[PDB]
Short mmCIF file of C-alpha atoms in Angstrom, two decimals:
data_model
loop_
_atom_site.label_atom_id
_atom_site.label_comp_id
_atom_site.label_asym_id
_atom_site.label_seq_id
_atom_site.Cartn_x
_atom_site.Cartn_y
_atom_site.Cartn_z
CA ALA W 1 78.28 18.95 -19.51
CA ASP W 2 81.72 19.38 -20.56
CA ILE W 3 82.81 16.07 -19.57
CA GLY W 4 80.05 14.14 -21.66
CA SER W 5 81.01 16.46 -24.89
CA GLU W 6 84.82 15.42 -24.24
CA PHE W 7 83.37 11.66 -24.08
CA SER W 8 81.26 12.36 -27.11
CA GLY W 9 84.31 13.62 -29.55
CA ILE W 10 86.36 10.68 -28.39
CA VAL W 11 83.68 8.21 -29.24
CA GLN W 12 82.92 9.98 -32.54
CA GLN W 13 86.46 9.84 -33.21
CA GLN W 14 86.61 5.82 -32.27
CA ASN W 15 83.57 5.55 -35.10
CA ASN W 16 86.04 7.35 -37.45
CA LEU W 17 88.82 5.37 -36.90
CA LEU W 18 86.73 2.37 -37.20
CA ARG W 19 85.17 3.23 -40.54
CA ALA W 20 88.70 3.93 -41.90
CA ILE W 21 89.42 0.54 -41.06
CA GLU W 22 86.45 -0.81 -42.35
CA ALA W 23 87.20 0.90 -45.63
CA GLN W 24 90.99 -0.08 -46.03
CA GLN W 25 89.75 -3.80 -45.46
CA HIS W 26 87.63 -3.64 -48.69
CA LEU W 27 90.59 -2.24 -50.13
CA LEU W 28 92.98 -4.98 -49.17
CA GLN W 29 90.07 -7.40 -50.38
CA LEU W 30 90.43 -5.93 -53.85
CA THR W 31 94.52 -6.08 -53.88
CA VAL W 32 94.26 -9.78 -52.79
CA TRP W 33 91.56 -10.14 -55.64
CA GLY W 34 93.78 -8.63 -58.19
CA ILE W 35 97.19 -10.38 -57.26
CA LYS W 36 95.34 -13.90 -57.62
CA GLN W 37 94.06 -12.91 -60.99
CA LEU W 38 97.13 -11.86 -62.29
CA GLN W 39 98.92 -15.01 -60.54
CA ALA W 40 96.63 -16.97 -62.40
CA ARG W 41 97.42 -15.31 -65.66
CA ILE W 42 101.01 -15.58 -65.49
CA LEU W 43 100.83 -19.35 -64.90
CA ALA W 44 98.77 -19.57 -68.30
CA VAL W 45 101.79 -17.70 -69.99
CA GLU W 46 104.37 -19.87 -67.81
CA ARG W 47 102.62 -22.75 -69.02
CA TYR W 48 102.23 -21.72 -72.95
CA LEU W 49 106.36 -21.37 -72.34
CA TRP G 1 86.14 -9.18 -70.94
CA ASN G 2 88.50 -9.04 -68.03
CA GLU G 3 88.80 -5.50 -69.40
CA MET G 4 85.73 -4.25 -68.43
CA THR G 5 86.21 -6.12 -64.92
CA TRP G 6 89.44 -4.60 -64.35
CA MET G 7 87.97 -1.43 -65.15
CA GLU G 8 85.80 -2.27 -62.30
CA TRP G 9 88.14 -3.37 -60.17
CA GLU G 10 89.85 0.26 -60.82
CA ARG G 11 86.55 1.88 -60.06
CA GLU G 12 85.76 0.06 -57.08
CA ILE G 13 89.35 1.20 -55.59
CA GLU G 14 88.90 4.51 -56.33
CA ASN G 15 85.52 5.01 -54.87
CA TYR G 16 86.80 3.04 -51.36
CA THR G 17 90.04 5.37 -51.88
CA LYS G 18 87.74 8.64 -52.04
CA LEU G 19 85.58 7.26 -49.07
CA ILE G 20 88.94 6.63 -47.09
CA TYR G 21 90.00 10.17 -47.83
CA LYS G 22 87.12 11.66 -46.76
CA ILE G 23 86.68 9.86 -43.67
CA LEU G 24 90.37 11.16 -42.64
CA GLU G 25 89.43 14.38 -43.29
CA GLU G 26 87.09 13.89 -40.99
CA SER G 27 89.22 12.70 -38.72
CA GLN G 28 91.97 15.66 -38.47
CA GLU G 29 88.83 18.07 -37.37
CA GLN G 30 88.69 15.91 -34.19
CA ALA Y 1 94.06 16.13 -12.48
CA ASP Y 2 94.03 12.05 -12.80
CA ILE Y 3 90.91 12.62 -15.13
CA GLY Y 4 92.73 14.96 -17.11
CA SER Y 5 95.37 12.65 -17.45
CA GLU Y 6 92.95 9.59 -18.42
CA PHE Y 7 91.40 11.82 -21.40
CA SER Y 8 95.03 12.80 -22.23
CA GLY Y 9 96.18 9.28 -22.75
CA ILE Y 10 93.16 8.05 -24.81
CA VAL Y 11 93.45 11.14 -27.40
CA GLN Y 12 97.18 10.68 -27.54
CA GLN Y 13 96.58 7.13 -28.33
CA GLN Y 14 93.41 7.93 -31.17
CA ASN Y 15 96.31 10.14 -32.61
CA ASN Y 16 98.61 7.08 -32.90
CA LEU Y 17 95.99 4.91 -34.27
CA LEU Y 18 95.14 7.50 -36.90
CA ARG Y 19 98.91 7.73 -38.11
CA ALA Y 20 99.18 3.93 -38.29
CA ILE Y 21 96.11 3.67 -40.49
CA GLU Y 22 97.65 6.97 -42.86
CA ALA Y 23 100.86 5.45 -43.05
CA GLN Y 24 98.89 2.01 -43.77
CA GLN Y 25 96.88 3.79 -46.67
CA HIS Y 26 100.19 4.96 -48.07
CA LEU Y 27 101.38 1.44 -48.27
CA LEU Y 28 97.88 0.13 -49.66
CA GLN Y 29 98.14 2.86 -52.59
CA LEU Y 30 101.66 1.54 -53.46
CA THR Y 31 100.07 -1.82 -53.81
CA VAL Y 32 97.58 -0.70 -56.05
CA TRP Y 33 100.60 1.04 -58.18
CA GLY Y 34 102.21 -2.17 -58.04
CA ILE Y 35 99.33 -4.25 -59.17
CA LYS Y 36 98.48 -1.87 -61.80
CA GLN Y 37 102.05 -1.94 -63.10
CA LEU Y 38 102.12 -5.73 -63.39
CA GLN Y 39 98.93 -6.16 -65.51
CA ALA Y 40 99.93 -3.67 -67.76
CA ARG Y 41 102.88 -5.79 -68.19
CA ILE Y 42 101.07 -9.08 -68.15
CA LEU Y 43 98.82 -8.16 -70.93
CA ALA Y 44 101.90 -6.71 -73.17
CA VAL Y 45 103.48 -10.20 -72.97
CA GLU Y 46 99.84 -11.68 -73.57
CA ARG Y 47 99.43 -9.50 -76.76
CA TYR Y 48 103.01 -10.91 -78.15
CA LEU Y 49 101.76 -14.02 -77.76
CA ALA S 1 81.51 3.63 -11.17
CA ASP S 2 79.86 4.60 -14.49
CA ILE S 3 82.77 6.89 -15.28
CA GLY S 4 85.30 4.27 -14.66
CA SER S 5 82.84 1.94 -17.21
CA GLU S 6 82.70 4.92 -19.67
CA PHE S 7 86.59 4.39 -19.56
CA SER S 8 86.80 0.96 -20.02
CA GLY S 9 84.52 0.81 -22.59
CA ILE S 10 86.44 3.23 -24.47
CA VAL S 11 89.92 1.70 -23.94
CA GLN S 12 88.70 -1.43 -24.88
CA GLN S 13 87.23 -0.17 -28.19
CA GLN S 14 90.84 1.36 -28.42
CA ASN S 15 92.63 -2.20 -27.97
CA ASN S 16 90.28 -3.17 -30.91
CA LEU S 17 90.98 -1.21 -33.28
CA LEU S 18 94.71 -1.25 -32.64
CA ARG S 19 94.28 -5.14 -32.88
CA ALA S 20 92.64 -4.82 -36.73
CA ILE S 21 95.42 -2.49 -37.52
CA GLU S 22 97.62 -5.30 -36.84
CA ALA S 23 96.11 -7.86 -38.39
CA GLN S 24 95.58 -5.49 -41.70
CA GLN S 25 99.50 -5.07 -41.76
CA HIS S 26 100.22 -8.32 -41.94
CA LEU S 27 97.71 -8.63 -44.72
CA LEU S 28 99.63 -5.81 -46.16
CA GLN S 29 102.87 -7.41 -45.63
CA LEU S 30 101.15 -10.44 -47.44
CA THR S 31 100.28 -8.50 -50.39
CA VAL S 32 103.68 -6.62 -50.67
CA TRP S 33 105.26 -10.45 -50.93
CA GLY S 34 102.82 -11.57 -53.37
CA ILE S 35 103.51 -8.57 -55.69
CA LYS S 36 107.41 -8.96 -55.61
CA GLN S 37 107.18 -12.84 -56.55
CA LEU S 38 104.74 -12.07 -59.46
CA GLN S 39 107.20 -9.19 -60.58
CA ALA S 40 110.26 -11.35 -60.28
CA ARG S 41 107.84 -14.08 -62.40
CA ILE S 42 107.18 -11.45 -65.26
CA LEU S 43 110.65 -10.54 -65.63
CA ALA S 44 111.84 -14.02 -66.44
CA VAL S 45 109.06 -14.26 -69.08
CA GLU S 46 109.80 -10.55 -70.28
CA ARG S 47 113.58 -11.66 -70.75
CA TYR S 48 112.45 -14.90 -72.29
CA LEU S 49 110.80 -12.95 -75.08
CA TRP N 1 114.15 2.08 -66.39
CA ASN N 2 111.36 0.61 -64.23
CA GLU N 3 114.06 -1.25 -62.70
CA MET N 4 115.66 2.18 -60.99
CA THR N 5 111.58 2.75 -60.24
CA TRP N 6 111.01 -0.69 -58.60
CA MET N 7 113.67 0.17 -56.46
CA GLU N 8 111.78 3.07 -55.82
CA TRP N 9 108.99 1.30 -55.54
CA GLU N 10 110.27 -1.18 -52.85
CA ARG N 11 112.30 1.56 -50.73
CA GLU N 12 108.93 3.45 -50.06
CA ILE N 13 107.01 0.10 -49.07
CA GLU N 14 110.27 -0.07 -46.49
CA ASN N 15 110.02 3.25 -45.22
CA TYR N 16 106.30 3.44 -44.65
CA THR N 17 106.60 -0.10 -43.20
CA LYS N 18 109.02 1.17 -41.00
CA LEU N 19 106.96 4.11 -40.05
CA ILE N 20 104.25 1.93 -39.22
CA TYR N 21 106.38 -0.54 -36.81
CA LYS N 22 107.40 2.95 -34.72
CA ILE N 23 103.80 3.77 -34.50
CA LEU N 24 102.67 0.14 -33.28
CA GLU N 25 105.27 0.09 -30.90
CA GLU N 26 104.53 3.73 -29.49
CA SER N 27 100.35 2.53 -29.48
CA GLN N 28 101.42 -0.68 -27.22
CA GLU N 29 103.27 1.11 -24.41
CA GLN N 30 99.76 3.11 -24.26
CA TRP K 1 106.82 -25.90 -55.42
CA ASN K 2 105.48 -22.20 -55.23
CA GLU K 3 102.41 -24.06 -56.04
CA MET K 4 102.52 -25.42 -52.16
CA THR K 5 103.97 -21.80 -50.97
CA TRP K 6 101.09 -19.92 -52.90
CA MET K 7 98.74 -22.20 -51.28
CA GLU K 8 100.06 -21.65 -47.79
CA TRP K 9 99.90 -17.35 -48.98
CA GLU K 10 96.30 -18.12 -49.51
CA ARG K 11 95.75 -19.78 -46.13
CA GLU K 12 97.79 -16.98 -44.44
CA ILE K 13 95.61 -14.24 -46.36
CA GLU K 14 92.10 -16.30 -45.36
CA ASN K 15 93.65 -16.87 -41.84
CA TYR K 16 94.16 -12.96 -41.25
CA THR K 17 91.20 -11.92 -42.81
CA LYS K 18 89.05 -14.40 -40.57
CA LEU K 19 90.94 -12.57 -37.38
CA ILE K 20 90.10 -8.79 -38.79
CA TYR K 21 86.38 -10.01 -39.43
CA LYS K 22 86.33 -11.32 -35.68
CA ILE K 23 87.78 -7.82 -34.19
CA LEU K 24 85.49 -5.99 -36.54
CA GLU K 25 82.49 -7.95 -35.55
CA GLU K 26 83.39 -7.18 -31.47
CA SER K 27 83.91 -3.60 -32.72
CA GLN K 28 80.44 -3.13 -33.22
CA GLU K 29 78.78 -4.05 -30.28
CA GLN K 30 81.05 -1.34 -28.54
#
């Protein structure tokens, strides 16, 4: 009824929030990869010099 | 070719950002 | 009543969580910019050498 | 009862989502540190050259 | 001057981090 | 030794990522 509708709106929104957190975690992981790549390259430079 | 792979990286970033914007768009209508 | 108060506490908290996710996305975007900037600069170095 | 159980499931899930956001913020902070470190090092290189 | 802009970048980081801490503070009292 | 500290950094990343995976695992069963 309307109480069921209220619960279902809330749970649907919880799933949305969870999905956003999950996609953001993939983004965070992509930034960590990119940082490690750059750190490795800066070292190779630093050692050449 | 890290160039091809940094291009991969960028496309992955772009795809996840597009998905997050989509989810945020659906979350405002709730 | 108290059921309404319970729902309102929960929805208010959902809005908080959403706002945190939104600010964190801006932070993620700032880190992606910073990584791209550094990647471009490291390349210019790498090509000089 | 079952309404209480429904509320408790939802609040428990809100706490989970909050905890994920909190851990992700620490990750974001670690990436910001790493970017600043790399930016400083790339500058030292850039000035040597 | 990327210096002025990396300074912008830092201030943006600082502002969004301050906002996130504020929101997290409000979310503990719920 | 930034080496020892980048190693610290990595371990911190690994620990927070492990915690986030754990929390996400608990959040699917809800």
